[PDB]
Structure 1
């Protein structure tokens, strides 16, 4: 580690889900290869799975660029501007299908330590504690061992 890595407080993008839920995933870029065993799992994902996946999520733009490459990759871009690049080199159809769905659920914020598992903007409703909360008032507000007039 925690000391050796940065950290952030729990938060969302523009208070997602407060009035409506907005899918933070914005773009998917797949780079598969026509020839190459490294993309065997990725090619099967494109042939049967990405078509049905695009049906479920209309707000995410999916690009399938078929070019020669040794390591197929999936690039996910989010609304907040963070870009997450992942490699699907030699992965089964099920492993790719689960990984892509995980990217859809994330908001794009950095995957680092979160200081608190809770975040509230109005933690106090009856008044935040102050040292005079539980102290009774004295007549004329006189101080201890103080004489007036």
Structure 2
């Protein structure tokens, strides 16, 4: 550590939930390799999971960029300007589904 790290108080963005609930996640950017063992899970996620997630979260804009990469990543951007980059390297579809939904629910 507490002494070695920063801290903050419990807070919300724009009093979210007081009048209405707004999903803070607005953008997800995926980088996926067409070829690359580490992107196998990300490729499978794009085939069978991304479309259903996109419909469930119309407020979020999802960019899927297929290009050569060794480490596939998902960049999550929020309404308050926060940018959170995560790695989906060698993650299964279930693990990627869990991470993506976790990003969707964070403020």
Q: TM-score, normalised by structure 1?
A: 0.71
Show CA shifts across 1:67-115 (max 9, x none).
0000000000000001000000000110000100000000xxxxxxxxx
Determine the C-alpha separation between the residues in 1 that align with 2:29 and 2:67: 12
Determine the C-alpha separation between the residues in 1 that align with 2:9 and 2:18: 18
Determine the C-alpha separation between the residues in 2 that align with 1:14 and 1:46: 32
Give aligned pairs, total: 107
| Higher RCO structure, 1 or 2 (CA under 8 Å, sep 6+) | 2
The RMSD of aligned alpha carbons is: 6.4
Show CA shifts across 1:52-81 (max 9, x none).
000100000000000000000000000000
SS of corresponding position for 2:49? helix
Determine the C-alpha separation between the residues in 2 that align with 1:95 and 1:60: 20
Q: TM-score, normalised by structure 2?
A: 0.98
Shift of 1:38: 0.5
Structure 1, gaps ≥5 residues long: 107-148
Equivalent in the alignment of 2:14: 14
